[PDB]
DNA sequence: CAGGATGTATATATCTGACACGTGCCTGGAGACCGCGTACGTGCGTTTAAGCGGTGCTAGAGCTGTCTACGA
DNA sequence: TCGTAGACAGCTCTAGCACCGCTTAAACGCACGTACGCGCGTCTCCAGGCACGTGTCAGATATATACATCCTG
DNA sequence: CAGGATGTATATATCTGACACGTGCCTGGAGACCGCGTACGTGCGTTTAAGCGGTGCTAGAGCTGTCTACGA
DNA sequence: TCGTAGACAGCTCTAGCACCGCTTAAACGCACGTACGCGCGTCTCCAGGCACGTGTCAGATATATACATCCTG
């Protein structure tokens, strides 16, 4: 038993920030022009100026635990469990056969056959044409294909381009992995001993004519927290460290006082800290800490980070004698809510209070934001309270591209006679 | 002591890009001088004629590319004559 | 699917029928005029692999010397097939008698199956591809390529 | 600045300016001469390097033997003319035994 | 054509060239895929070298030097 | 009847343990002699650095690895699996080491 | 003795080593006389390179270079 | 007409020496300086390369013969290598 | 066991053109600093096209003078 | 900074390309059969060197010997 | 037709040393200008010496400063 | 003429050579037999690069499994 006195993170450690207690009924937003939203063949079912309700995905006859956020990929697992279906099925990134493809539909049980051997799936993954599930047994679920830096179609290096089946991956790595990290078309995964492992591209560690994708290692060195955003990586070492190695054009691993990755750096916590979670998109980079106050880099361009004009960083991007061009300074601010968890998108920063109120800080001109009828972008966060999910208490966070996955439940005295403070 | 200018430090660093984790041996870790060894050496006289059999006393890129072509074998050739186009292309946009 | 993708699959169908040997939807009959011909029991459809020419395969003169004895006695019929197989004469000599298919096939320059070079890992493989939808009860038929006017004039079926 | 920092390309391009004109190559070499043959080197360096990188993950465990080096190079079909005049050091051959040589009933 | 261009009684005249007693039937056009194989490694260099000139007329000592780098440098001409 | 190997198999696997190691197959001390031994002919009262010593092996080593290898077909080309005399020459005529 | 130094589960050894399915009995020595042919060869070349510097210790890089020179330019030390 | 400095002169001299009639081909009297192209070549490189394996940036007569030796077979070397210190001892000897 | 049909070694008349030597010229070099069996050979008839030259058209190699951006 | 090689428009003219009927050498086709595959640094002075022109002897040429050599009744 | 004797693929504890990264330093790089038959394989016993290191001796490679004859 | 590479005496110290008993891997010898051969450019500023030192994880190591594989009654 030379492996037991090796692993130093758990599937159950892991289980805060991924499924929960009761069965929500789910939401949606923004223009899902890829039948994304799932809101049937209806091309009035498309728009959205504000939030809504699921009507084929209701809280009780589906019964949906798990969610999983992307930009033509949004699929859900239950406790049951289930495999939910609403993405553009395109590069097999729906996972069956299917219009249909703007109708939640449940995956069959023969396709995966852990589920017909004694074990559920801890997280649903979903990158820009990917899909894979991290089983509880030890082995990874798999579909769809990602999208290559040049621009083309791979699944398993050369022995696979368009992986629409879902299928197993083989072993990579003995020990079990943990969790999952989804973002681009870079997937990348984390060993029971603490191995950050990579599959994809991950371009922004480097090589030709393919054979990369398949496997597998390296880097890091005993990572607790693996947490991908699109071209941005991110990785925490069990020795209380913070590295982000990816594509800092715009700051997006917060290790550079001027505006790529080589090897990871990332974070200077002064005094102390514990960060309790963290995602990031294209140029929006965020990580949250166990207190309260949150700690974002990203662009200033888009609108993708929440601080508009008045509160700019010192140590922030500007032009050569223009606008301000980014933000790669961490920093919570001071006029902000208690955030916690969160969800990002390309910049459409979907975050969750601690009395489950919304607030969408990021470019909401298709609508990702959820606030009505309005082209502008979000310059912070927008407290968001409508008729469905005012009172309903918000659970699980999500955002795609011109998306954000919204869903929980209708709340009781609980959350008005509780919280109705204001 | 005179100074052993080897290839050691920077045929390590272009290992790193490639593979993070490891990793080379000490015999090996020669073999590698020896590969940029007979490439520099061979590169430079399919450079260096090229100059002679085409009369112009200045080896430019003009040669060293076109023996690069001429001395790399077949689908590597238009990788590293890519490469070098790069190269070529970052070396002139610099401030 | 690709071209690559359909050729792949194209080749592995083929590969199958030259391992197995199989001549399913294919019987003999007695032609009027012709000895012996092939006849079809089922529908063809084109492109399809109708059948391999088989018998011993060999060199340039390695097929052209059983030639100069089978002259030394008529009776025994020309079955031999040459071909150019990667720069080199490689054929395969279908004189002697046995319940392959492919050998009793008869002569038409306006048939319904063309014969093309198959290469399985370096060993050449004559067979025989549907040219157009081969009818059920009509004869298969295919491209002899002996125009020349000595085996002309011996027999005239060769130029129609 | 350093020209490597400019152009892009990891060993040592001033290098390859300096060894350029003292090696006795020609008379004259133009700046990119150097840039571009770096880059022809460095492309090699790596195209081969990575190559050693995947096989020496597969037999052994992280670090390249000679043996896995040579172990690659004989095996692209490419590389193995560009080193199929060469005898790369504690190789040993990439096994192979003849149709004729292996068990046979 | 091209390949049948280097014709039986001259495959078998550069054969007996060196005392080839007999070819046998296959052997023939053999000798056109390597001829082919030679004729084609060659020229690709020669005209790579013609290149890197600017030649559209290729020159002998193009061939001459290629026919050198390839390995077999050729004397006379050059 | 004891434990045995039908004759081949055992060589056989000659070949996949020796076609494994980068093991140099010939001993030091022995070569230091063929060394030192063709030196004399060469220049009487010398020396050389043991580093060096080694590559001549390696070399001729490896030369003849394949030299044995090249001749694996002399034979295997003519109608045998057992490598005779004759067939390590015509290997050397094919190379032009001699003819 | 120096040629009776390549012994016979060496010669073997080094002839297994690119797969001998069996070595004959002439054989054996053939390899000493070719090894030492190729001894023969190298070695002289050499030792005349490390003359043209006047090193009465033989460098490796000196055995490289004429390794080099030779045909077969060995990789490693050099 | 630029000049082309050909050695067929030097070659039909040297002919002559050796044999008075006569004599020789247009193709084979190109063949000889081909003779004398990849000597003068050969010899150059084995004499340019020496400097740098041996540190000295002018190629003395202490290379060129070295070569020479190095580079001519066994027979004929010791010949040239005696024809060499011949125009060697000739050359110191003049007025 | 041997003399006669093939075609190769040999001899010598005879025209043709490339080897060879003279010349004005110009630049580079010198000076001072065993057996079944079929594949391929041999030889003669039919037939394809290589080799021949006669020659007009002009692509494009080769050389020159000028302006100027390259690299020591 | 600055000497100058390289870019380049401009221009002489060698030499490569297409033409095209014709004597015929040669590629092609085929029948017979037997040997053989196959299984059992710089300024200056100047003459050495090269492009050019021109006469003829080495050698290609061809009719014509004699000769060595291979093979069946 | 198949289960048991060889020895190869595989797993994991554990010490060792070479890979790898930090540092003062100094010079090179930067900047402005089918069948008879015997030969060779397989396996175990006898025996030669390779490999091991421990180490003292010093040849001779390597580096430096000086004088001066070589060659652009 | 004259800048300077090469000759060369002088000197530090790496590294090659001889030593030499000993555990033992390996070369050697030999008997049995069956698969197999064989016949039928320059002055200046300075940080990139290398020699040096030092800590430890990749890998050599070894006892110890389990495993694929070859072969006769």
């Given at each position: 038993?030379?492996?037991?006195?090796?692993i130093?993170?758990?599937?159950?450690?892991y289980?805060?920030?991924?499924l929960?207690?009761?069965?929500?009924?789910?939401?949606?937003?923004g223009?899902g022009?890829?039948?994304?939203?799932?809101?049937?063949?209806?091309?009035?079912?498309?728009?959205?100026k504000?939030?809504?309700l699921?009507?084929?995905l209701?809280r009780?006859?589906?019964?949906?635990?798990?969610?999983?956020?992307?930009?033509?990929?949004?699929?859900?697992?239950?406790?049951?469990?289930?495999?939910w279906?609403?993405?553009?099925?395109?590069?097999?990134?729906?996972?069956?056969?299917?219009?249909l493809?703007?109708?939640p539909?449940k995956?069959?049980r023969?396709?995966?056959?852990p589920?017909?051997?004694?074990?559920?799936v801890v997280?649903?993954?979903?990158?820009?044409?990917?899909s894979?599930?991290?089983?509880?047994?030890?082995?990874?679920?798999a579909?769809?294909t990602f999208?290559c830096?040049?621009?083309?179609?791979?699944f398993?290096?050369?022995?696979?381009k368009?992986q629409?089946?879902?299928?197993?991956?083989?072993?990579?790595?003995?020990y079990?992995?943990?969790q999952?990290?989804?973002?681009?078309?870079?997937?990348?995964?984390?060993?029971?001993?603490?191995?950050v492992?990579?599959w994809?591209?991950?371009?922004?560690?480097?090589?030709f004519?393919?054979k990369?994708?398949?496997?597998?290692?390296?880097?890091?060195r005993?990572?607790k927290?693996?947490?991908?955003?699109?071209?941005?990586?991110?990785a925490?070492?069990?020795?209380?460290?913070?590295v982000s190695?990816?594509?800092?054009?715009?700051?997006?691993?917060?290790?550079?006082e001027?505006?790529?990755?080589?090897?990871?750096?990332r974070?200077?916590?002064?005094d102390n800290?514990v960060?309790?979670?963290?995602?990031?998109?294209?140029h929006?980079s965020?990580?949250?800490?166990?207190?309260g106050?949150?700690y974002?880099?990203?662009?200033?361009?888009?609108?993708?980070?929440?601080?508009?004009?008045?509160?700019?960083?010192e140590?922030?991007?500007?032009?050569?004698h223009?606008?301000?061009?980014?933000?790669?300074?961490?920093?919570k601010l001071?006029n902000?809510?208690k955030?916690?968890?969160v969800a990002?998108?390309?910049?459409?920063?979907?975050?969750?209070?601690?009395?489950?109120?919304?607030?969408?800080?990021?470019?909401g001109?298709?609508?990702?934001?959820?606030?009505?009828?309005?082209?502008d972008?979000?310059?912070?966060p927008?407290?968001?309270?409508?008729t469905?999910?005012?009172?309903?208490?918000?659970?699980?966070?999500?955002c795609?591209?011109?998306?954000?996955?919204?869903?929980?439940?209708?709340?009781?005295?609980?959350?008005?006679?509780?919280?109705?403070?204001? | 002591?005179?100074?052993?200018?080897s290839y050691?430090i920077?045929?390590?660093?272009?290992?790193?890009?490639?593979?993070?984790?490891?990793?080379?041996?000490?015999?090996?870790?020669?073999?590698?001088?020896?590969?940029?060894n007979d490439?520099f050496?061979r590169?430079?006289?399919?450079?260096?004629?090229?100059?002679?059999?085409?009369?112009?006393?200045?080896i430019?890129?003009?040669?060293?590319?076109?023996?690069?072509?001429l001395?790399?074998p077949?689908?590597?050739?238009?990788?590293?004559?890519?490469?070098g186009?790069?190269?070529?292309?970052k070396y002139?946009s610099?401030? | 699917?690709?071209?690559?993708?359909?050729?792949?699959?194209?080749?592995k169908?083929?590969?199958?029928?030259?391992?197995?040997?199989?001549?399913?939807?294919?019987?003999?009959?007695?032609?009027?005029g012709?000895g012996?011909?092939?006849?079809?029991?089922?529908?063809?459809?084109?492109?399809?692999?109708?059948?391999?020419?088989?018998?011993?395969?060999?060199?340039?003169?390695?097929?052209?010397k059983?030639?100069?004895?089978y002259?030394?006695?008529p009776?025994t019929?020309?079955?031999?097939?040459?071909?150019?197989?990667?720069s080199?004469?490689?054929?395969?000599?279908?004189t002697?008698e046995?319940?392959?298919?492919g050998?009793?096939?008869?002569?038409?320059?306006?048939?319904?199956?063309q014969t093309?070079?198959?290469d399985?890992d370096?060993?050449?493989?004559?067979?025989?591809?549907?040219?157009?939808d081969?009818?059920?009860?009509?004869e298969?038929?295919?491209?002899?390529?002996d125009?020349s006017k000595?085996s002309i004039?011996?027999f005239?079926?060769?130029?129609? | 600045?350093?020209?490597?920092?400019?152009?892009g390309?990891?060993?040592?391009?001033?290098?390859?300016h300096?060894?350029?004109?003292?090696?006795?190559?020609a008379?004259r070499?133009?700046?990119?001469?150097?840039?571009?043959?770096?880059?022809?080197?460095e492309?090699?360096?790596?195209?081969?390097?990575?190559?050693?990188?995947?096989?020496?993950r597969?037999?052994?465990?992280?670090?390249?033997?000679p043996?896995?080096?040579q172990?690659?190079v004989?095996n692209?079909?490419?590389?193995?003319?560009?080193?199929?005049?060469?005898?790369?050091?504690?190789?040993?051959?990439?096994?192979?035994?003849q149709?004729?040589?292996?068990?046979?009933? | 054509?091209?390949?049948?261009?280097?014709?039986?009684?001259?495959?078998r005249?550069?054969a007996?060239?060196?005392?080839?007693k007999?070819?046998?039937?296959?052997?023939?056009?053999?000798?056109?895929?390597?001829?082919?194989v030679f004729?084609?490694?060659?020229?690709?260099?020669?005209?790579?070298?013609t290149?890197?000139?600017?030649?559209?007329t290729?020159?002998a000592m193009?061939?001459?030097?290629?026919l050198?780098?390839?390995?077999?440098?050729?004397?006379?001409?050059? | 009847?004891p434990?045995?190997?039908?004759?081949?198999?055992?060589?056989?696997?000659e070949?996949?343990?020796?076609?494994?190691?980068?093991?140099?197959?010939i001993?030091?001390?022995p070569?230091?002699?063929?060394?030192?031994?063709?030196?004399?002919?060469?220049?009487?009262?010398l020396?050389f650095?043991?580093?060096?010593?080694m590559?001549?092996?390696?070399?001729?080593?490896?030369?003849?690895?394949?030299?044995?290898?090249?001749?694996?077909?002399?034979?295997?080309?003519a109608?045998?699996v057992?490598?005779?005399?004759?067939?390590?020459?015509?290997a050397?005529?094919?190379?032009?080491?001699?003819?």
């Amino acid at each position: 038993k030379t492996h037991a006195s090796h692993i130093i993170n758990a599937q159950e450690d892991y289980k805060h920030m991924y499924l929960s207690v009761q069965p929500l009924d789910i939401f949606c937003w923004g223009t899902g022009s890829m039948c994304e939203l799932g809101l049937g063949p209806l091309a009035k079912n498309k728009e959205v100026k504000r939030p809504r309700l699921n009507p084929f995905l209701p809280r009780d006859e589906a019964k949906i635990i798990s969610f999983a956020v992307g930009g033509m990929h949004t699929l859900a697992l239950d406790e049951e469990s289930n495999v939910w279906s609403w993405g553009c099925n395109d590069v097999g990134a729906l996972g069956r056969d299917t219009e249909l493809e703007s109708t939640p539909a449940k995956i069959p049980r023969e396709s995966f056959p852990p589920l017909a051997e004694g074990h559920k799936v801890v997280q649903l993954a979903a990158t820009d044409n990917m899909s894979c599930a991290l089983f509880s047994n030890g082995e990874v679920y798999a579909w769809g294909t990602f999208r290559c830096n040049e621009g083309i179609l791979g699944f398993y290096q050369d022995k696979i381009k368009i992986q629409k089946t879902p299928w197993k991956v083989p072993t990579f790595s003995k020990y079990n992995i943990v969790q999952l990290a989804p973002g681009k078309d870079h997937i990348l995964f984390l060993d029971e001993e603490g191995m950050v492992f990579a599959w994809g591209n991950g371009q922004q560690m480097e090589r030709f004519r393919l054979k990369t994708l398949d496997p597998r290692p390296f880097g890091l060195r005993h990572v607790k927290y693996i947490a991908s955003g699109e071209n941005h990586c991110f990785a925490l070492t069990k020795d209380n460290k913070l590295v982000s190695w990816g594509l800092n054009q715009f700051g997006q691993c917060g290790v550079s006082e001027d505006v790529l990755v080589t090897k990871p750096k990332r974070l200077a916590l002064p005094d102390n800290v514990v960060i309790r979670s963290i995602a990031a998109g294209e140029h929006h980079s965020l990580i949250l800490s166990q207190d309260g106050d949150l700690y974002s880099c990203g662009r200033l361009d888009m609108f993708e980070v929440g601080i508009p004009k008045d509160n700019l960083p010192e140590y922030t991007y500007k032009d050569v004698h223009g606008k301000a061009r980014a933000v790669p300074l961490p920093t919570k601010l001071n006029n902000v809510p208690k955030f916690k968890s969160v969800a990002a998108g390309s910049h459409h920063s979907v975050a969750v209070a601690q009395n489950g109120i919304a607030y969408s800080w990021g470019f909401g001109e298709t609508y990702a934001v959820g606030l009505g009828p309005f082209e502008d972008d979000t310059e912070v966060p927008t407290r968001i309270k409508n008729t469905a999910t005012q009172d309903h208490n918000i659970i699980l966070v999500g955002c795609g591209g011109q998306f954000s996955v919204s869903g929980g439940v209708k709340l009781s005295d609980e959350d008005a006679e509780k919280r109705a403070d204001e | 002591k005179t100074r052993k200018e080897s290839y050691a430090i920077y045929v390590y660093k272009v290992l790193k890009q490639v593979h993070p984790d490891t990793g080379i041996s000490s015999k090996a870790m020669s073999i590698m001088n020896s590969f940029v060894n007979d490439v520099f050496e061979r590169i430079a006289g399919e450079a260096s004629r090229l100059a002679h059999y085409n009369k112009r006393s200045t080896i430019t890129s003009r040669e060293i590319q076109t023996a690069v072509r001429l001395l790399l074998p077949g689908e590597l050739a238009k990788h590293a004559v890519s490469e070098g186009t790069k190269a070529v292309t970052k070396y002139t946009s610099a401030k | 699917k690709s071209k690559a993708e359909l050729q792949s699959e194209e080749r592995k169908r083929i590969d199958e029928l030259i391992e197995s040997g199989k001549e399913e939807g294919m019987k003999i009959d007695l032609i009027d005029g012709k000895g012996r011909g092939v006849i079809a029991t089922k529908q063809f459809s084109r492109g399809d692999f109708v059948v391999e020419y088989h018998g011993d395969l060999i060199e340039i003169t390695d097929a052209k010397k059983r030639e100069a004895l089978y002259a030394q006695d008529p009776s025994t019929g020309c079955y031999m097939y040459y071909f150019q197989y990667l720069s080199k004469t490689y054929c395969v000599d279908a004189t002697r008698e046995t319940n392959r298919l492919g050998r009793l096939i008869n002569h038409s320059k306006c048939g319904n199956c063309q014969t093309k070079l198959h290469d399985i890992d370096g060993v050449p493989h004559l067979i025989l591809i549907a040219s157009r939808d081969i009818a059920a009860g009509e004869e298969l038929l295919y491209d002899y390529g002996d125009r020349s006017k000595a085996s002309i004039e011996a027999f005239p079926w060769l130029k129609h | 600045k350093t020209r490597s920092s400019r152009a892009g390309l990891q060993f040592p391009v001033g290098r390859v300016h300096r060894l350029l004109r003292k090696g006795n190559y020609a008379e004259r070499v133009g700046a990119g001469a150097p840039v571009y043959l770096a880059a022809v080197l460095e492309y090699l360096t790596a195209e081969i390097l990575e190559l050693a990188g995947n096989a020496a993950r597969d037999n052994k465990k992280t670090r390249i033997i000679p043996r896995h080096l040579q172990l690659a190079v004989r095996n692209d079909e490419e590389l193995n003319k560009l080193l199929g005049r060469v005898t790369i050091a504690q190789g040993g051959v990439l096994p192979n035994i003849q149709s004729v040589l292996l068990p046979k009933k | 054509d091209n390949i049948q261009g280097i014709t039986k009684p001259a495959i078998r005249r550069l054969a007996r060239r060196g005392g080839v007693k007999r070819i046998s039937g296959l052997i023939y056009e053999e000798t056109r895929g390597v001829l082919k194989v030679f004729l084609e490694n060659v020229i690709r260099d020669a005209v790579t070298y013609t290149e890197h000139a600017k030649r559209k007329t290729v020159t002998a000592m193009d061939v001459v030097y290629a026919l050198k780098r390839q390995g077999r440098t050729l004397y006379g001409f050059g | 009847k004891p434990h045995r190997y039908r004759p081949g198999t055992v060589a056989l696997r000659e070949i996949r343990r020796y076609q494994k190691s980068t093991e140099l197959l010939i001993r030091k001390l022995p070569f230091q002699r063929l060394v030192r031994e063709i030196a004399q002919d060469f220049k009487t009262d010398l020396r050389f650095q043991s580093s060096a010593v080694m590559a001549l092996q390696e070399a001729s080593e490896a030369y003849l690895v394949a030299l044995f290898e090249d001749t694996n077909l002399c034979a295997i080309h003519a109608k045998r699996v057992t490598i005779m005399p004759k067939d390590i020459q015509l290997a050397r005529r094919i190379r032009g080491e001699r003819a």
